[PDB]
Design an enzyme around this catalytic site. Structure first.
Site, PDB file in Angstrom:
ATOM      1  N   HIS A 167      -9.814   1.739  12.552  1.00 24.52           N
ATOM      2  CA  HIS A 167      -8.969   0.633  12.106  1.00 24.52           C
ATOM      3  C   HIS A 167      -8.819  -0.377  13.244  1.00 24.52           C
ATOM      4  O   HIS A 167      -7.757  -0.543  13.848  1.00 24.52           O
ATOM      5  CB  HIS A 167      -7.619   1.164  11.644  1.00 24.52           C
ATOM      6  CG  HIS A 167      -6.710   0.114  11.085  1.00 24.52           C
ATOM      7  ND1 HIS A 167      -5.337   0.229  11.109  1.00 24.52           N
ATOM      8  CD2 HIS A 167      -6.977  -1.066  10.479  1.00 24.52           C
ATOM      9  CE1 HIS A 167      -4.797  -0.836  10.548  1.00 24.52           C
ATOM     10  NE2 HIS A 167      -5.770  -1.637  10.154  1.00 24.52           N
ATOM     11  N   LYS A 217      -9.754   0.558   2.376  1.00 25.07           N
ATOM     12  CA  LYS A 217      -9.062   1.652   3.047  1.00 25.07           C
ATOM     13  C   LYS A 217      -9.568   3.009   2.574  1.00 25.07           C
ATOM     14  O   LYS A 217      -9.801   3.903   3.393  1.00 25.07           O
ATOM     15  CB  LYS A 217      -7.554   1.540   2.823  1.00 25.07           C
ATOM     16  CG  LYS A 217      -6.932   0.245   3.342  1.00 25.07           C
ATOM     17  CD  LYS A 217      -7.059   0.125   4.848  1.00 25.07           C
ATOM     18  CE  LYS A 217      -6.351  -1.125   5.370  1.00 25.07           C
ATOM     19  NZ  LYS A 217      -6.462  -1.254   6.843  1.00 25.07           N
ATOM     20  N   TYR A 225      -2.905  -3.347  -6.185  1.00 21.48           N
ATOM     21  CA  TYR A 225      -2.656  -4.283  -5.094  1.00 21.48           C
ATOM     22  C   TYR A 225      -3.483  -3.886  -3.876  1.00 21.48           C
ATOM     23  O   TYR A 225      -3.342  -2.771  -3.362  1.00 21.48           O
ATOM     24  CB  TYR A 225      -1.168  -4.319  -4.746  1.00 21.48           C
ATOM     25  CG  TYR A 225      -0.780  -5.439  -3.807  1.00 21.48           C
ATOM     26  CD1 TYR A 225      -0.438  -6.693  -4.295  1.00 21.48           C
ATOM     27  CD2 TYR A 225      -0.755  -5.240  -2.432  1.00 21.48           C
ATOM     28  CE1 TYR A 225      -0.082  -7.719  -3.442  1.00 21.48           C
ATOM     29  CE2 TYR A 225      -0.399  -6.263  -1.570  1.00 21.48           C
ATOM     30  CZ  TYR A 225      -0.064  -7.500  -2.080  1.00 21.48           C
ATOM     31  OH  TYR A 225       0.291  -8.523  -1.230  1.00 21.48           O
ATOM     32  N   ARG A 280       0.851  -1.184   0.000  1.00 25.51           N
ATOM     33  CA  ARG A 280       0.000   0.000   0.000  1.00 25.51           C
ATOM     34  C   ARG A 280       0.890   1.238   0.000  1.00 25.51           C
ATOM     35  O   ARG A 280       1.565   1.526   0.995  1.00 25.51           O
ATOM     36  CB  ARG A 280      -0.926  -0.029   1.212  1.00 25.51           C
ATOM     37  CG  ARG A 280      -1.670   1.250   1.475  1.00 25.51           C
ATOM     38  CD  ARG A 280      -2.564   1.098   2.689  1.00 25.51           C
ATOM     39  NE  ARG A 280      -1.857   0.514   3.823  1.00 25.51           N
ATOM     40  CZ  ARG A 280      -1.010   1.176   4.601  1.00 25.51           C
ATOM     41  NH1 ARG A 280      -0.706   2.442   4.370  1.00 25.51           N
ATOM     42  NH2 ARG A 280      -0.455   0.550   5.635  1.00 25.51           N
ATOM     43  N   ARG A 293      -0.528 -11.880   0.658  1.00 28.09           N
ATOM     44  CA  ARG A 293      -1.835 -11.887   1.295  1.00 28.09           C
ATOM     45  C   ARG A 293      -2.617 -13.133   0.908  1.00 28.09           C
ATOM     46  O   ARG A 293      -2.246 -13.882   0.001  1.00 28.09           O
ATOM     47  CB  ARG A 293      -2.646 -10.641   0.910  1.00 28.09           C
ATOM     48  CG  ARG A 293      -1.994  -9.332   1.293  1.00 28.09           C
ATOM     49  CD  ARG A 293      -2.377  -8.926   2.703  1.00 28.09           C
ATOM     50  NE  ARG A 293      -1.622  -7.760   3.143  1.00 28.09           N
ATOM     51  CZ  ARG A 293      -1.817  -7.132   4.292  1.00 28.09           C
ATOM     52  NH1 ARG A 293      -2.770  -7.506   5.131  1.00 28.09           N
ATOM     53  NH2 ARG A 293      -1.036  -6.104   4.610  1.00 28.09           N
ATOM     54  N   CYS A 349       0.682  -6.263  12.973  1.00 24.67           N
ATOM     55  CA  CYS A 349       1.036  -6.166  14.382  1.00 24.67           C
ATOM     56  C   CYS A 349       0.202  -7.054  15.292  1.00 24.67           C
ATOM     57  O   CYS A 349       0.527  -7.155  16.479  1.00 24.67           O
ATOM     58  CB  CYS A 349       0.928  -4.713  14.863  1.00 24.67           C
ATOM     59  SG  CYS A 349       2.201  -3.606  14.200  1.00 24.67           S
ATOM     60  N   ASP A 359     -10.253  -5.817  10.792  1.00 24.99           N
ATOM     61  CA  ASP A 359      -9.558  -4.672  10.211  1.00 24.99           C
ATOM     62  C   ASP A 359     -10.320  -3.364  10.373  1.00 24.99           C
ATOM     63  O   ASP A 359      -9.750  -2.358  10.806  1.00 24.99           O
ATOM     64  CB  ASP A 359      -9.274  -4.922   8.727  1.00 24.99           C
ATOM     65  CG  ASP A 359      -8.295  -3.919   8.141  1.00 24.99           C
ATOM     66  OD1 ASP A 359      -7.199  -3.760   8.718  1.00 24.99           O
ATOM     67  OD2 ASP A 359      -8.614  -3.293   7.109  1.00 24.99           O
TER      68      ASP A 359
HETATM   69  N1  LIG Z   1       5.357 -12.406  18.884  1.00 22.73           N
HETATM   70  C1  LIG Z   1       4.087 -12.360  18.420  1.00 22.73           C
HETATM   71  N2  LIG Z   1       3.910 -12.176  17.092  1.00 22.73           N
HETATM   72  C2  LIG Z   1       2.673 -12.118  16.553  1.00 22.73           C
HETATM   73  C3  LIG Z   1       1.512 -12.258  17.447  1.00 22.73           C
HETATM   74  N3  LIG Z   1       0.424 -12.165  16.660  1.00 22.73           N
HETATM   75  C4  LIG Z   1       0.853 -11.980  15.382  1.00 22.73           C
HETATM   76  N4  LIG Z   1       2.198 -11.957  15.315  1.00 22.73           N
HETATM   77  C5  LIG Z   1       3.012 -11.774  14.082  1.00 22.73           C
HETATM   78  O1  LIG Z   1       2.607 -10.594  13.383  1.00 22.73           O
HETATM   79  C6  LIG Z   1       2.497 -10.846  11.981  1.00 22.73           C
HETATM   80  C7  LIG Z   1       1.265 -10.154  11.423  1.00 22.73           C
HETATM   81  O2  LIG Z   1       0.143 -10.498  12.231  1.00 22.73           O
HETATM   82  P1  LIG Z   1      -1.328 -10.090  11.726  1.00 22.73           P
HETATM   83  O3  LIG Z   1      -2.395 -10.611  12.664  1.00 22.73           O
HETATM   84  O4  LIG Z   1      -1.561 -10.575  10.314  1.00 22.73           O
HETATM   85  O5  LIG Z   1      -1.243  -8.483  11.765  1.00 22.73           O
HETATM   86  P2  LIG Z   1      -2.415  -7.569  11.152  1.00 22.73           P
HETATM   87  O6  LIG Z   1      -1.843  -6.776   9.999  1.00 22.73           O
HETATM   88  O7  LIG Z   1      -2.909  -6.633  12.228  1.00 22.73           O
HETATM   89  O8  LIG Z   1      -3.567  -8.417  10.671  1.00 22.73           O
HETATM   90  C8  LIG Z   1       2.397 -12.349  11.801  1.00 22.73           C
HETATM   91  O9  LIG Z   1       3.308 -12.759  10.781  1.00 22.73           O
HETATM   92  C9  LIG Z   1       2.791 -12.949  13.134  1.00 22.73           C
HETATM   93  O10 LIG Z   1       3.989 -13.713  12.970  1.00 22.73           O
HETATM   94  C10 LIG Z   1       1.785 -12.456  18.897  1.00 22.73           C
HETATM   95  O11 LIG Z   1       0.858 -12.586  19.732  1.00 22.73           O
HETATM   96  N5  LIG Z   1       3.065 -12.492  19.288  1.00 22.73           N
HETATM   97 MN   LIG Z   2      -5.266  -8.027   9.294  1.00 19.78          MN
HETATM   98 MN   LIG Z   3      -5.503  -2.921   8.096  1.00 20.01          MN
END
Ligand SMILES: Nc1nc2c(ncn2[C@@H]2O[C@H](COP(=O)(O)OP(=O)(O)O)[C@@H](O)[C@H]2O)c(=O)[nH]1
Ligand SMILES: [Mn+2]
Ligand SMILES: [Mn+2]
Ligand SMILES: [Mn+2]
Length: 620
Positions: free
Chosen positions: A262, A242, A233, A85, A403, A286, A309
């Site tokens: 968000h 978004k 993308y 993005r 993704r 995250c 999201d």
């Molecule tokens: N150390 C740790 N890493 C995490 C945890 N949850 C997610 N991750 C890492 O963060 C990355 C992205 O997580 P995701 O749920 O897809 O983030 P999103 O963008 O908010 O959806 C993943 O590749 C995980 O490896 C957690 O509880 N602890």
């Molecule tokens: Mn997500």
């Molecule tokens: Mn998002």
């Protein structure tokens, strides 16, 4: 009528009828058909047959592959330049610059990019005249939120990319019934073009059409229009995600008095039979998706998912803050999703799922880093760069931002009320980012004003979602830094104002940090399914249990308050440690950031919370 017949595009409609389109809907189609000059016009109906002929075309064109190993799953490899993005080329056009961003006290603003109508008119005419020459224009009618729902909004996206049309069918409620519901109501105008008219003057990489040089994602909230060009993308081409549901919706919510945020939405139930809905706002990559479909390690605890999201929230008649998931599918990060981390994810992406930029295995499967799964002997992997990849190389087989696009209805732990137009009552709000040190595991806000401050003071290290690189901790207030639809000062004001509504039932506010490290460089907290233990403490604080300890930054859990059974070896000393030396510098950066970026549009209550905290930290 007309004098000749240069404005009747009926002869180019391969599916649908401009005579069946609503008044101001047909004008929008014909106007842009004249401007982009598409070869054909396809009025989508969202039917299973339409989705069939769409996939087949992309396959016969060399865009997507079929993953024979699973039920109706497809891979797609994009141009290595159109992989994320683009936040630097995302602009909002308003008459006055203050409506969009607060004027910085010194340098440039980090809370958005504003562009005048004069500058945008020139850049527009340099991009869209004839951009769909020789392509088909798809008329996507989609609905954000349930049909007939109150906080539901309808949009029309025009695009020359069948990759968008298919995604929009997963991510939104797209079809003919959305047209009959709109009638003559208002709708959002979305325009999208990959910017590769035929004949191709630039050879394509991986059969992925895109014009990186001219990429621009512009928002005109005054006109209810979104205009995206060059990119294709996810966040750049799914204009209803978004661009609409966050940026445009935030301005509409401010005007109408609701909230577009968000945030994920999850419901959790305890062994006693009580269920509560929580909402978490984390930056991209995250932890939102892993948390929304968490497989909890505590017995008798159940966690269902409503969204991962976007959330649209508004106070109901009874003072309850209700929320809805306006989306229809999940657009999550692939790398790191294993049967051990996100097992609920694995059960959903096995069918009707469109993967993008992940690796393919020679037996028709998908492969990415952290999948934690041994492949059979003789099975070979092809990376996202369409190259024969071996674990001996340094190039990762799947792209970091690769993704998957799966329908929400397929989720095993899908909440039985995510389609409920009435929403779900929210009893808690969670913030947090990737803080490698300093921030304790979890703490609770002292008041509504302090909580709003906690979100204003969010920071996190640069992940792999936008174009930011390096281990740099940057500000991301409310996880909404790249999605602010209007002035951030008035945004903050909009949140503090919720304390003035009559008979309001404001939710508690928490801040978590899964990503704290030690002096060696090891995650002090297991996380993922173990984060359920921090959810148990929050569930009790909502019921009003005395398990908190007052500290100079907020209520932290008491001694012996966390259910740590099954671990014991965890270092609680450093996991909840609150160093004066660290927080004295943290407020210094938070001070400089708020004074410079929000400048004169900063509400007084937030500055009062900054002072109050600056004081309690010096009294240690
Ligand atoms: N150390 C740790 N890493 C995490 C945890 N949850 C997610 N991750 C890492 O963060 C990355 C992205 O997580 P995701 O749920 O897809 O983030 P999103 O963008 O908010 O959806 C993943 O590749 C995980 O490896 C957690 O509880 N602890
Ligand atoms: Mn997500
Ligand atoms: Mn998002
Ligand atoms: Mn007030």
């Amino acid at each position: 009528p007309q004098l000749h017949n240069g404005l009747d595009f009926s002869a180019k409609v391969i599916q649908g009828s401009l005579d069946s389109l609503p008044q101001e809907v047909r004008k929008f189609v014909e106007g842009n058909a004249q401007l982009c000059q598409p070869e054909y016009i396809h009025i989508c109906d969202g039917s299973e047959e339409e989705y069939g002929r769409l996939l087949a075309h992309m396959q016969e064109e060399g865009v997507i592959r079929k993953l024979k190993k699973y039920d109706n799953c497809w891979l797609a490899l994009t141009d290595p330049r159109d992989v994320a993005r683009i936040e630097s080329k995302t602009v909002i056009i308003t008459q006055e610059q203050r409506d969009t961003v607060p004027i910085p006290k010194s340098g440039q603003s980090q809370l958005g990019r504003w562009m005048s109508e004069e500058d945008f008119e020139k850049a527009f005419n340099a991009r869209f005249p004839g951009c769909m020459k020789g392509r088909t224009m798809y008329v996507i009618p989609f609905s954000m939120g349930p049909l007939g729902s109150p906080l539901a909004k309808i949009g029309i996206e025009l695009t020359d990319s069948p990759y968008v049309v298919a995604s929009m069918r997963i991510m939104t409620r797209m079809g003919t019934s959305v047209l009959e519901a709109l009638g003559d109501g208002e709708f959002i105008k979305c325009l999208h073009s990959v910017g590769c008219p035929l004949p191709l003057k630039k050879p394509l990489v991986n059969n992925w059409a895109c014009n990186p040089e001219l990429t621009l994602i512009a928002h005109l909230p005054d006109r209810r229009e979104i205009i995206s060009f060059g990119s294709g993308y996810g966040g750049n081409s799914l204009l209803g995600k978004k661009c609409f549901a966050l940026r445009i919706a935030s301005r509409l919510a401010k005007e109408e008095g609701w909230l577009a945020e968000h945030m994920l939405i999850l419901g959790i139930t305890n062994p006693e039979g009580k269920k509560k809905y929580l909402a978490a706002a984390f930056p991209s990559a995250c932890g939102k998706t892993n948390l929304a479909m968490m497989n909890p390690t505590l017995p008798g605890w159940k966690v269902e998912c409503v969204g991962d999201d976007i959330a649209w929230m508004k106070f109901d008649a009874q003072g309850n803050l209700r929320a809805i998931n306006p989306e229809n599918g999940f657009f999550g990060v692939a790398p790191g999703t294993s049967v051990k981390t996100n097992p609920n994810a694995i059960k959903t992406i096995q069918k009707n799922t469109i993967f993008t930029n992940v690796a393919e295995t020679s037996d028709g499967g998908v492969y990415w880093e952290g999948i934690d799964e041994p492949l059979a002997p003789g099975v070979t992997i092809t990376s996202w760069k369409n190259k024969e990849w071996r674990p001996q190389d340094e190039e990762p087989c799947a792209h970091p931002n690769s993704r998957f696009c799966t329908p929400a209805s397929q989720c095993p732990i899908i909440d039985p009320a995510w389609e409920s137009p009435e929403g779900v009552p929210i009893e808690g709000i969670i913030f947090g980012g990737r803080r490698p040190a300093g921030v304790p595991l979890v703490y609770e806000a002292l008041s509504w004003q302090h909580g709003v401050f906690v979100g204003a003071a969010m920071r996190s290290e640069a992940t792999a979602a936008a174009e930011h690189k390096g281990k740099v901790i940057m500000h991301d207030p409310f996880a909404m830094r790249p999605f602010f639809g209007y002035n951030f000062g008035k945004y903050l004001a909009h949140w503090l104002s919720m304390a003035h509504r009559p008979a309001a039932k404001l939710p508690k506010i928490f801040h978590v940090n899964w990503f704290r490290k030690d002096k060696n460089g090891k995650f002090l907290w297991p996380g993922f399914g173990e984060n359920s233990r921090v959810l148990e403490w929050m569930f009790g604080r909502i019921e009003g249990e005395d398990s908190a300890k007052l500290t100079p930054i907020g209520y932290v859990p008491k001694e012996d308050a966390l259910n740590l059974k099954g671990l014991g070896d965890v270092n609680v000393e450093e996991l909840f440690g609150i160093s004066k030396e660290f927080w004295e510098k943290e407020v210094e950066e938070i001070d400089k950031y708020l004074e410079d970026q929000v400048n004169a549009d900063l509400p007084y209550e937030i500055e009062r919370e900054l002072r109050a905290l600056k004081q309690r930290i010096s009294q240690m």
